[PDB]
CSV table of C-alpha atoms in Angstrom, one decimal:
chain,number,residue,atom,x,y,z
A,1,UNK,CA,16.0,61.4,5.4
A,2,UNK,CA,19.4,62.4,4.0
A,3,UNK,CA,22.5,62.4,7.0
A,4,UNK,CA,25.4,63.3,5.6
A,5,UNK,CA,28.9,62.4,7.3
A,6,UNK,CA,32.1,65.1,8.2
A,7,UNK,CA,34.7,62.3,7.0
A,8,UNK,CA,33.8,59.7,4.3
A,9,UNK,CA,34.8,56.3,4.9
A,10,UNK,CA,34.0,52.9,3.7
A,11,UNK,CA,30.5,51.4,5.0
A,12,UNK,CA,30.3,48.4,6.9
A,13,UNK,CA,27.3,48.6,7.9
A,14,UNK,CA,25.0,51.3,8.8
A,15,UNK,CA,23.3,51.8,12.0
A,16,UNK,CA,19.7,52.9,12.1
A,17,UNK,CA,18.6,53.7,15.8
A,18,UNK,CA,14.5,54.0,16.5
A,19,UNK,CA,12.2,55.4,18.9
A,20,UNK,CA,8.9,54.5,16.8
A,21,UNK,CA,8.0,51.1,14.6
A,22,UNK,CA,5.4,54.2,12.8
A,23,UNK,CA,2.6,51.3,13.5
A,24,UNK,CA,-0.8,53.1,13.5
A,25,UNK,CA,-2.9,51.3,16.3
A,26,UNK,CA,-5.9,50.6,13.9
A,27,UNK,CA,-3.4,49.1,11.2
A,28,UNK,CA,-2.1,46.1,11.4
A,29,UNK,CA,0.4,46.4,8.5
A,30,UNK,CA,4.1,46.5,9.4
A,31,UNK,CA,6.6,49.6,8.3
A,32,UNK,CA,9.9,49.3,5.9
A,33,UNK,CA,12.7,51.7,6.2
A,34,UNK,CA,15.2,51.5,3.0
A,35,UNK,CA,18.5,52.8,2.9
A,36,UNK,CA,20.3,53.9,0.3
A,37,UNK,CA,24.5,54.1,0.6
A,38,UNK,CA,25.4,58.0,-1.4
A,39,UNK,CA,29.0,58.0,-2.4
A,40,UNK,CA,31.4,61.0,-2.9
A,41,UNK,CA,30.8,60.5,-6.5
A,42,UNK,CA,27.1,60.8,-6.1
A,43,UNK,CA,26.0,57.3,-6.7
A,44,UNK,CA,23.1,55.3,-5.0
A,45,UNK,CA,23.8,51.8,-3.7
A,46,UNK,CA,20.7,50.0,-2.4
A,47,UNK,CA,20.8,48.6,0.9
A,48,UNK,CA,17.0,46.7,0.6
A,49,UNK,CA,13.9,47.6,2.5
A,50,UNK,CA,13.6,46.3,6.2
A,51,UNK,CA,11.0,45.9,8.9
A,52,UNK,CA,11.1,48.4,12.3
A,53,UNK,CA,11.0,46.2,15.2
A,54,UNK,CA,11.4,48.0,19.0
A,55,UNK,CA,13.4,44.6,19.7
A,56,UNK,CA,15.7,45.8,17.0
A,57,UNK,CA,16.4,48.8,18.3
A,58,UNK,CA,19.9,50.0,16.5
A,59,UNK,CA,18.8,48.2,13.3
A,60,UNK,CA,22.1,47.2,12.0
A,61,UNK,CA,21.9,46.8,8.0
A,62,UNK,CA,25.0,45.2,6.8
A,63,UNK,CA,26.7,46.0,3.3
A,64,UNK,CA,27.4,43.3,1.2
A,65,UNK,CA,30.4,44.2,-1.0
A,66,UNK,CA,31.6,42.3,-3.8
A,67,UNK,CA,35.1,42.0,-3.2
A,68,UNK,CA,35.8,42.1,-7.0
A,69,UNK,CA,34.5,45.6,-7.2
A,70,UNK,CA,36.3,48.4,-6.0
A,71,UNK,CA,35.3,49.8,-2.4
A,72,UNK,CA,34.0,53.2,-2.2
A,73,UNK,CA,33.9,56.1,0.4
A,74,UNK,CA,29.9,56.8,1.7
A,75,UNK,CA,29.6,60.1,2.2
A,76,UNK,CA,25.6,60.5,2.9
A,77,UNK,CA,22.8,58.2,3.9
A,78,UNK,CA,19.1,58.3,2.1
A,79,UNK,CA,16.7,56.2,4.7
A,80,UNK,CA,13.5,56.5,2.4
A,81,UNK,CA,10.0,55.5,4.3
A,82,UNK,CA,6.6,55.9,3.5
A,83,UNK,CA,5.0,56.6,6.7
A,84,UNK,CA,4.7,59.6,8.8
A,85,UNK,CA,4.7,58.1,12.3
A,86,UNK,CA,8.5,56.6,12.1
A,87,UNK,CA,11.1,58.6,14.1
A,88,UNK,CA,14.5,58.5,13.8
A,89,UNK,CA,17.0,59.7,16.8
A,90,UNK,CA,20.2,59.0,14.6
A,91,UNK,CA,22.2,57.6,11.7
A,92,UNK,CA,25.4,56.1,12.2
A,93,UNK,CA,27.9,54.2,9.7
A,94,UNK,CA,30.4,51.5,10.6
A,95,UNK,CA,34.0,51.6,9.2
A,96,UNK,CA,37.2,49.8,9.5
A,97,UNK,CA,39.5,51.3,12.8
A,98,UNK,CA,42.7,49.5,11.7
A,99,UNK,CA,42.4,50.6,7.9
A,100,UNK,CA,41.3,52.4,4.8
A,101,UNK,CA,40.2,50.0,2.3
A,102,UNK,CA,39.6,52.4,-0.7
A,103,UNK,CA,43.0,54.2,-0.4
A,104,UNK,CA,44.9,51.0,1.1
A,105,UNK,CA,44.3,49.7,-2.9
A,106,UNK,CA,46.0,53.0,-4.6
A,107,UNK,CA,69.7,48.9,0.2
A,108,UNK,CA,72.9,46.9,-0.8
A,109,UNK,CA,75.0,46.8,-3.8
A,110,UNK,CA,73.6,44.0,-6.7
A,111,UNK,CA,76.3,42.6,-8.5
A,112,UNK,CA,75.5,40.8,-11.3
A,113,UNK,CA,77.8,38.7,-13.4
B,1,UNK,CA,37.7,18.6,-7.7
B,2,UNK,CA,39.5,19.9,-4.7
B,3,UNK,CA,42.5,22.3,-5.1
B,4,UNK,CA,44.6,23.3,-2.2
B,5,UNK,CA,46.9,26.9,-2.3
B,6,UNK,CA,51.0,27.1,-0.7
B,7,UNK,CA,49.7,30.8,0.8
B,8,UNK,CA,46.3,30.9,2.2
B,9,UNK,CA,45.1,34.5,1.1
B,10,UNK,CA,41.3,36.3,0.8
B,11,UNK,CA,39.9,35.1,-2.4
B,12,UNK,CA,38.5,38.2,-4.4
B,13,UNK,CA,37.6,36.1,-7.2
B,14,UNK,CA,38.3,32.6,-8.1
B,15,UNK,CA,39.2,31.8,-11.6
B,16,UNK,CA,38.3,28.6,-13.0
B,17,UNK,CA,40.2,28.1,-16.6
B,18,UNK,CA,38.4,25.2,-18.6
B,19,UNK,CA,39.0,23.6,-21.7
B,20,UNK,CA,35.5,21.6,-22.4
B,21,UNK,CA,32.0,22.9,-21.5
B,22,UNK,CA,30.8,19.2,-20.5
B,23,UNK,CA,27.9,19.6,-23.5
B,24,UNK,CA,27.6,16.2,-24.9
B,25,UNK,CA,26.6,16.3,-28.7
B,26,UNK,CA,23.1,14.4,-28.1
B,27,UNK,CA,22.1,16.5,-25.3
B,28,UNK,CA,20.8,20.2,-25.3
B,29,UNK,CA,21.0,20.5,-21.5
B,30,UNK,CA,23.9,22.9,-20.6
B,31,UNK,CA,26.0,22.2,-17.5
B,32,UNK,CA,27.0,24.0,-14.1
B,33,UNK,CA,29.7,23.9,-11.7
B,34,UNK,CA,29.4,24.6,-8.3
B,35,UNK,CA,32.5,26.3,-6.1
B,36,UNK,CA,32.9,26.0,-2.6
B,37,UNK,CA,35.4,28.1,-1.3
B,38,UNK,CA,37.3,26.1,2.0
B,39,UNK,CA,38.7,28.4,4.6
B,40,UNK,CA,41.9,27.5,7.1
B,41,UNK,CA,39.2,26.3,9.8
B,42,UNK,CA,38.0,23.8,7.0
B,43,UNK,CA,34.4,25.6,6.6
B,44,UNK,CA,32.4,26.0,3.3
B,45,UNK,CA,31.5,29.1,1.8
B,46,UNK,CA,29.0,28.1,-1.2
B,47,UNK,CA,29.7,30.9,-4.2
B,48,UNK,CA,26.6,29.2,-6.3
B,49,UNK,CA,26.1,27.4,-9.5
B,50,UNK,CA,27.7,28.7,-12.9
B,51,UNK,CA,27.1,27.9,-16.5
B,52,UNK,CA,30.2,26.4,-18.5
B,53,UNK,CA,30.6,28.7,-21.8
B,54,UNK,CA,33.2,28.5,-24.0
B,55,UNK,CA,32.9,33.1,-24.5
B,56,UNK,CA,33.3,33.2,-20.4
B,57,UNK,CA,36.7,31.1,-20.6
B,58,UNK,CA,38.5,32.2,-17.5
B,59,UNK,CA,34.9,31.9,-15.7
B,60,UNK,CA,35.8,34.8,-13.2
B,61,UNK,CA,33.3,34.3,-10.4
B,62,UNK,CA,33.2,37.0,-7.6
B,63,UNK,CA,32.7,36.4,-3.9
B,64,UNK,CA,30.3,38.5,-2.5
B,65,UNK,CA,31.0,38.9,1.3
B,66,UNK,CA,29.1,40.5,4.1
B,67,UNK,CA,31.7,43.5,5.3
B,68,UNK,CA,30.0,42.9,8.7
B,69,UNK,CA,31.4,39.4,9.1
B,70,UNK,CA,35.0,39.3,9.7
B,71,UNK,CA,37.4,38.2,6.5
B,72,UNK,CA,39.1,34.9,6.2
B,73,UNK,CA,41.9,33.0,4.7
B,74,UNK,CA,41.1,30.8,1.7
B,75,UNK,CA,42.9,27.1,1.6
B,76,UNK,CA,41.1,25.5,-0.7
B,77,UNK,CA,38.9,25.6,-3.4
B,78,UNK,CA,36.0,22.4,-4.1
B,79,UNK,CA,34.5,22.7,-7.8
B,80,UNK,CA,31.7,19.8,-7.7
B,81,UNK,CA,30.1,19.3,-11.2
B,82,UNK,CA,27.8,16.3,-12.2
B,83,UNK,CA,29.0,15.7,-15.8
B,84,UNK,CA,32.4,13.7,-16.4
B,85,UNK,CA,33.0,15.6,-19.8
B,86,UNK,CA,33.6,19.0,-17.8
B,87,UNK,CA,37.5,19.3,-17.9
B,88,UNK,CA,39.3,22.2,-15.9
B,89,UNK,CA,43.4,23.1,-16.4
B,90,UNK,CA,43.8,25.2,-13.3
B,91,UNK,CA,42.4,26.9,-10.6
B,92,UNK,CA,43.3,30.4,-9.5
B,93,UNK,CA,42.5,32.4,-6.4
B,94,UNK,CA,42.5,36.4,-6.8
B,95,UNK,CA,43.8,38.6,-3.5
B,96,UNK,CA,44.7,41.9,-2.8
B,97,UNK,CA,48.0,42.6,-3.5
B,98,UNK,CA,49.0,45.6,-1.6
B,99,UNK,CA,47.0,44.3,1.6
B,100,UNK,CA,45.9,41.2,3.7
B,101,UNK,CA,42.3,42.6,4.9
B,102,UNK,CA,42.3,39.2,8.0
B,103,UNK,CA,45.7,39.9,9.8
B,104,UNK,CA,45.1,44.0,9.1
B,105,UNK,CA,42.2,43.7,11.4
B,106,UNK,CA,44.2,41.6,14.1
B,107,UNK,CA,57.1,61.2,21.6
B,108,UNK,CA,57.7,64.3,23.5
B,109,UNK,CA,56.8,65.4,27.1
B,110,UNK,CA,53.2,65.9,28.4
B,111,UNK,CA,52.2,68.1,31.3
B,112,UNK,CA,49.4,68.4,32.6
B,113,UNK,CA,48.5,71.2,35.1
């Protein structure tokens, strides 16, 4: 499932709202969803594989970001699944309000004798 | 070894400048050095164990933090390592110059008909 966004920001975390776990009722295995951050430079950033709970319903993923690296605008959202009976009402991603991190990092006379 | 900072910034990085691995010249084992990063509200933030090598002199170590979680102020920084022959000349903390990402977060006439 590939949501793309109208304005890229940074990525705090991305919200993942569900109407279905996909749990077949004659299998008692439980269903991942992973999520994969897509930049404006076309990169993946892996976001890890998590269980689909009803309890959790907004699953809130949040991104870890070295903060030696340089942050980077998200522009679309892969949530890759392998099951068919998972439904997803919408994708949401979570940014700063006060502030742009990526582009926040780009008088009298002196006399001297 | 506990180091305390005048300006209590984000730490980025911490740089950890040493002048002996610790290896003792009977002994194959190779030494670590744990850094705990110590916030304004005097909490721990453990950044893991590190081997000593005398290629990786600065010994940049990144801080990895949750975007999620708000930031904080760095005071100090506690470098605990269990092998007296381990000798460190200074201690740096790495911030973002241009911004301060914990306090960041902190017309004419209109008629209507």
């Amino acid at each position: 499932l590939r949501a793309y966004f109208s304005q890229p920001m940074v990525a705090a975390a991305v919200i993942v709202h569900l109407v279905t776990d996909g749990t077949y009722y004659g299998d008692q295995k439980q269903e991942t969803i992973s999520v994969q951050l897509l930049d404006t430079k076309d990169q993946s950033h892996d976001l890890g594989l998590h269980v689909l709970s009803c309890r959790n319903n907004p699953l809130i993923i949040p991104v870890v970001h070295d903060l030696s690296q340089p942050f980077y605008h998200s522009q679309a959202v892969r949530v890759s699944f392998s099951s068919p009976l998972v439904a997803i009402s919408g994708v949401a991603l979570r940014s700063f309000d006060n502030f742009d991190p990526v582009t926040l990092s780009s008088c009298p006379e002196l006399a001297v004798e």
